[PDB]
Amino acid sequence: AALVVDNGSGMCKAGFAGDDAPRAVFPSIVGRPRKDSYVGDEAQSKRGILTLKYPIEHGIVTNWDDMEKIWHHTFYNELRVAPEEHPVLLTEAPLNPKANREKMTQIMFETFNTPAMYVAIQAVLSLYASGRTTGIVMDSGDGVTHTVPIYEGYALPHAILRLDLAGRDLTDYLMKILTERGYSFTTTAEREIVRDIKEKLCYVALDFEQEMATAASSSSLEKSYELPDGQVITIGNERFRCPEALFQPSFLGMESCGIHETTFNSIMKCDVDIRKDLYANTVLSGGTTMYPGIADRMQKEITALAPSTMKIKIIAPPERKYSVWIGGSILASLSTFQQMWISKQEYDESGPSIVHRKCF
């Protein structure tokens, strides 16, 4: 049955429609020496002898030879399947240019000979996975954050906002502020540590200025992190300062609005009629929305921006790290969907532009 490939700036997720989870998740990295290319964990573990390139920049593909290598690796290496035997559902960023969507289609039929394929907007899948066709998706990943208003299955272009602030940026920041504390993480292995601390110990303060005040006057918020070798390194206010940068992006030297303001602006950019539904259906997705306390904080921040009237509801599924993928698995495994596949016949008739009839 169908393949589901969720291309990401940091990681790709691949598996089979109908499964609870992707069977493979690997770094979106292509390495070349001076075999003539390696992808993923294999490339990383040969870092010292390969030139590394990241083909997906901020959700958008910028190098097509490398992206084809990732897909080749996905099929013949990770999933160990013949692509000419399975329908393939691929995902795309919001506001992906038509030119890109056509190239994806071209590669699938012409290089991989897929019998059928489809391209869905990642955000629409996340909303789908939550059992909705209307709402606003806040998707924060490794490379980008998007706020994507959706109404009855239709993502609204005029109202989509992009924020080039995500996971990398947060890991980068935690690295910087731990250095402050007297720790040093210059190597690439030491970066894996920082990222681990970020994913295990960080959290969003409800009230940031009080949280600062508590930390300055109490140790009740400090937690210790144990390294492989047994070395324990203590983390204090950097636990909540790091993710705070999502709400106060000046922390990273950036001249952009927080995630909360950006969400509000996206809603505000819609016709006054559907806002009630967007406000009451704000859905969080992506690894960078995984911090404890984030949903409470969003609730409070949006509440503060929105008219008093509005019921505000933030939905933060526990499955949200993979909600894009799980959406793809749900969509591609419905019999009611098998109608929506774009076949080799239609492509050899209409060519790469037929893909724009994606209703997802």
Add this chain to the structure above:
Amino acid sequence: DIAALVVDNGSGMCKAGFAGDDAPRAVFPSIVGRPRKDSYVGDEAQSKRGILTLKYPIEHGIVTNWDDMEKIWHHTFYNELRVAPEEHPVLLTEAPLNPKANREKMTQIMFETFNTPAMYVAIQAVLSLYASGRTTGIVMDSGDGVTHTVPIYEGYALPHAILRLDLAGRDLTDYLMKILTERGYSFTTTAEREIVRDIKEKLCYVALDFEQEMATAASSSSLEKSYELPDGQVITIGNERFRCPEALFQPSFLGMESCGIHETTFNSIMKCDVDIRKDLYANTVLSGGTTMYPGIADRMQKEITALAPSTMKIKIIAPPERKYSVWIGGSILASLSTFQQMWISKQEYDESGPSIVHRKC
């Protein structure tokens, strides 16, 4: 505020109006007549029946003559609605299972002949379900020329599960004409056909239990009703009242092989995956003039209930405004703020030719 145009093409009648309105402004017979000014459409063509050759360009929901359909749309814009079509977006409707080739042509005509700034094509059934406030359910749409059963799920018609029944209003009027002749009335003239139709629309009803009602008709006159003609001549009608629309359930009455409307609906539901049937059974929506019979909803309820698994919650929704529910759906859909995203622009037409319509969604 510039309102979009909503044109519901139909086998018997076309309905036209402006998005936002409760109702189409114009409803007129889908007829193009030509003599042997060189063409007339609608009521104007009928009233000159004697000197024109009338043709029906929409046979069973599907356009079969493009020259004539073009005339119908010209008449709609410039004659019935009195608008320049290049000032307004146009939403047109199409039958279920409309071939790709016909969609292309519709699109071509709109941009190339009528210079519309934007257009959109919706499946009639999907609009009926939409007008009822739903995105999931099954629509039983019975009109003048055709009956379709159309399962829809989350805004999407399931074409594999769509069933077509070439039995509708025309067939029922023809039948009532036959059985009224049985009793000793003559309705030969086309004028007189208007009478039979009128009787069909005013006095007919669906019996809940047919055989029972036959016996009621046989044993007292309590079911007889009299119809008065313009000239004052009264004609009485008894069992023909319910026998006529019964043909929808028992098509053998018309000499036809086909299953009834209730079987057809059931089969359509059965053709769908089991994990959605619960929803289809609970959301069965009736649309089209031929579903206007009193008693029809009760009868469907009982008939489907008899066919369906016993555990199943059956619900037949028969809106009062169901004669125009297709149109009302179009007017709802086009009056939406997010409609603009959904349509095809003039810009996209210069770009991707008339095939743009398989590339829309």
